[PDB]
Design a protein around this ligand. Structure first.
Ligand SMILES: *SCCCNC(=O)CSc1ccc(Cl)cc1
Ligand SMILES: *SCCCNC(=O)CSc1ccc(Cl)cc1
Ligand SMILES: [Mg+2]
Ligand SMILES: [Mg+2]
Ligand SMILES: [Mg+2]
Ligand SMILES: [Mg+2]
Ligand SMILES: [Mg+2]
Ligand SMILES: [Mg+2]
Lengths: 236, 5, 236, 5
């Protein structure tokens, strides 16, 4: 790996610089290098890994959706034949996106998840596994699509089980996991009722626990609760 | 699109 | 070149798709491939080339400025020593930026400029040459810095001479050239009075020619005139 | 920064 000669601490330092410069591909490459040093990641380091890849894959997903919409329009009645270029370029972006997802899933499998014993790390990594299988599902059309969807589901479900046993209902990781698994139900698994029920129950159980929190923890939890409410408003 | 984090 | 097997028309088509998807690195690679087919570029194709590289290098410049500011702060009195990482990463971004500028300048020299005979193409390409030498000057600190500045100046000056002989004072290329050469004077050549005089005279000569224009041409010219006014307001 | 095009 091209980061093999750089110190772990230097990679983390540069990831933070790359974030300030909005250089998210660099940030992700630095964090990949840091993971590949083989040591477990701290809370802050897990967040840097997450932010870097979220921004890279989020840009790819946005571009894929633009291209897929153009491709869909090209296939409607009365549309002039424009050649293979739209499909080719959508496939190019799709393949790069799949490559990023495969890289993240590879880091999680070698060996972040198996060494993650505390709920805050294990839930975080299993949520990420669900998320990156969800991004693969968004673009999947082949024989393995059901298995990709089920891989996302399985990862989310393991994270949910741990989070409900080991974290308070206001924990931001627990909340963000529920938010994203609810989106999985709505957008991937054709299960809008499950999506709505999960978001509502998560929101209500968090509300009931806010009284236990400091002002700063309250801010953290209510920020994610508002996202749950935003989705419920969208869906009802 | 719905919100995710 | 990796685009050598793709049809010219397909590269142009994909450049337009990449623009819609905000994939400016791809857009630039497609347009580089199109240039390397060896045919002259139409007005629209010159604009695609310009837009692609402007967005790529603009992102690099913004990142370089963030990193340079952090590096400057690290070198102030009382700042803790943080190691070589800020300088290294600023140098990494700087080298990539210089590579992009060198690529654009290489396309202009092999062989866009020498085949450009009409004022609209020749001025456009010489303006671009000035612009990319200006971006190299922004990051230059070595023995060749004066020569880099003079290369920018020389390209801008040749473009200016042609534009004044061959284009009306409202031509958008002529206006954009004057805007950018004025910025060169102010920010690169330590010549704010020349920058101000050029912007003012350009604006006034364009104003006097607006009466000759259609509504659509008027819109095009006044858009760039407003940028000249914005700079004058900043500088006075 | 000043405007350029
Ligand atoms: S890529 C998400 C990690 C960065 N964290 C934040 O932006 C703070 S908010 C938050 C909290 C919990 C979760 Cl699972 C995501 C975001
Ligand atoms: S990279 C600039 C080419 C794209 N053109 C526009 O955005 C239209 S406005 C304009 C007009 C003239 C010049 Cl030199 C630059 C921009
Ligand atoms: Mg090592
Ligand atoms: Mg595919
Ligand atoms: Mg349940
Ligand atoms: Mg050919
Ligand atoms: Mg250097
Ligand atoms: Mg003069």
């Amino acid at each position: 790996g091209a980061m093999g000669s750089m110190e772990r601490a230097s990679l983390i330092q540069k990831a933070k610089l790359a974030e300030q410069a909005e250089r998210y591909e660099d940030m992700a490459a630095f964090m990949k290098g840091a993971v590949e040093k083989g040591e477990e990641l701290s809370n802050e380091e897990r967040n840097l890994l997450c932010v870097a890849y979220k921004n890279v894959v989020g840009g790819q997903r946005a571009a894929w959706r633009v291209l897929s919409s153009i491709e869909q329009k090209s296939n409607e009645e009365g549309s002039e034949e424009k050649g293979p270029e739209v499909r080719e370029y959508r496939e190019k972006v799709e393949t790069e996106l799949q490559g990023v997802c495969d890289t993240v899933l590879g880091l999680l499998d070698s060996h972040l998840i198996k060494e993650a014993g505390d709920a805050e790390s294990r839930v975080f990594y299993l949520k990420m596994k669900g998320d990156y299988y969800r991004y693969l599902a968004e673009v999947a059309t082949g024989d393995d699509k059901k298995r990709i969807i089920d891989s996302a589901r399985s990862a989310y479900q393991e994270a949910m089980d741990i989070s409900k046993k080991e974290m308070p209902p206001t924990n931001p990781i627990r909340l963000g996991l529920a938010l994203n698994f609810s989106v999985f139900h709505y957008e991937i698994a054709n299960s809008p009722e499950e999506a709505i029920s999960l978001a509502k129950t998560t929101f209500d159980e968090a509300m009931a626990d806010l009284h236990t929190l400091s002002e700063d923890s309250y801010k953290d939890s209510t920020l994610i609760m508002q996202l749950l409410r935003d989705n419920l408003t969208l869906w009802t | 699109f719905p919100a995710t984090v």
